[PDB]
Amino acid sequence: MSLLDQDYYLSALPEDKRAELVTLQLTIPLKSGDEVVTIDFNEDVDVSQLCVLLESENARPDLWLSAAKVFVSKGNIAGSQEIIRKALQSNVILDSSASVTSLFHNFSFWLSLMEYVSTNSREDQFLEYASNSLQASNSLDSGLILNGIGNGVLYAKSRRYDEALKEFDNLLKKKSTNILAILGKAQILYKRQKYSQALELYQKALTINPLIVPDPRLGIGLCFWHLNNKQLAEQAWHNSLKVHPQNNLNTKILICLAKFDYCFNESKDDDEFTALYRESLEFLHSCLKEDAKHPLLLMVLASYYFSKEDYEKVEKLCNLVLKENSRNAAFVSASHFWLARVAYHKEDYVQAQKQFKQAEDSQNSNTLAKLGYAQCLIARNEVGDATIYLEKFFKENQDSKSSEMMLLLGIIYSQSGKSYYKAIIFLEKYVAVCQEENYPILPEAYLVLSRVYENKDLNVALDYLMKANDILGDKANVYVLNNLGIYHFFRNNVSQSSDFFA
Amino acid sequence: RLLSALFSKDNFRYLMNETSDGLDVNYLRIPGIIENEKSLGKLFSSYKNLAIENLHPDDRLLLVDPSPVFFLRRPQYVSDG
């Protein structure tokens, strides 16, 4: 078949869009007349000398902005800002219309956006710089739709989603072929958790432009993850990596996470689990040979090293991530959770409970941190406190499928005795969730259910005891057999009772 | 081990929130959208020559609904004769 790569959509496009759009050499006419100069961006192009030459020759603003874009690709954000400023100082822009000055103001706006993005810090200062540049551009030329796109992006960064959505509605009124408007709308919808609504926009953008940056396939894979079709997500991410093999390590990280999830939830045997887990570790390490300080990779490796009893290195990585990415609360929550898990072996119940609470406060979506908090409450013999916390969490999250939480609730209520009905409900929910997940149902839940049903239904209790015995197999104990025999004796099953007693 | 099983169930669900770095959109990222002032319009009109057919078959497979039938005509107004 036809190879799926960047060259595929290169050949799909006409040769005008193939070579010219990716030229690393810029042709600049000279002020002397027909003389021109060609400077290759592969070589080390100096910003100051190039700007001085451009000002002397008074070249078209397109060349200035193209050089700025290339220096952006080089990462020279300061150099691109210098290019923009000296272009504003150039005679061409001063003698041109206000439209060119507005376009360069919007370019400086994009420069501020990239400076904020590349650092994820000083957000207010760069946002104010970008806002001032965008306001100047709009005042100089308000008819440019790029000013509206910049306004919408500014609203999105300040979480003014309604105004950005209105701006994208206006852009859709102007034209429905605007790819950037589609991307911004889909980003806002994903931020608003409208995964499917953003997914239609992702598909439309991908169909319109398969070579558009940012990659729509990243959002499509996120939606497939939200729609459980993670296999298609991985396939689309592989296609994106083929199209974008550079500066897209996040796709490889997502692929590694998907492989780890598949290994956890699909390995049919221990040997297959080991093979898949080691392959995922090798792929993660190969990605780490490019970047060795990525906080998410360290957090992921912390799980493996905690499973390897390397708690000291887990603490080192957690502290390093906390120092680097304290802005991200999710990393703080994960580090606190792992510190509490490490201290659990040390049984620092007060310290582990405090760490679990801090993890919950950092990121409330971390259910595991709350479950560890409840477990630590149990460790400190806080039966009532753990019960109250668990009831609060369940009543706030009645739709959450925390099977172990429901099992613990059932056990606590069985110990209480008076709340047997909630215990039955929670144990049945745990049984159903385990059956849906194809996970081994704990026979202890069956024993608790039989104990509860002793005073309600001997038939259901006996059936649950039989199910627990079938799960145990050779693990049947003396108490289970004695209770089965007593059940059959009460059922007048003399033969079965005698066999169970034997 | 109960918390380990809970982690395995959860895996890295809530850790994908930071991975949204691909959602950010910047104009300068595209190489050829800026080389001319109207390169945006040219590239928006460069893909009008392309369609779903020109998409790669594997990328077409990525277009999954979240075939024509012979008995559903498209309406007309002048007919023929």
């Binding site: 887990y277 080691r278 499973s307 194809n438 | 380990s4």
Partner: peptide
């Protein structure tokens, strides 16, 4: 039988021991 075959140590809770049985050397900075 794949429904019963998949039930093994990691599902039973011996996942940590399995990871301990998998040894790998990283180029750790810390």
């Amino acid at each position: 039988k794949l429904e019963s075959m998949v039930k093994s140590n990691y599902r039973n809770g011996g996942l940590d021991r399995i990871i301990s049985k998998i040894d790998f050397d990283f180029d750790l900075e810390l």
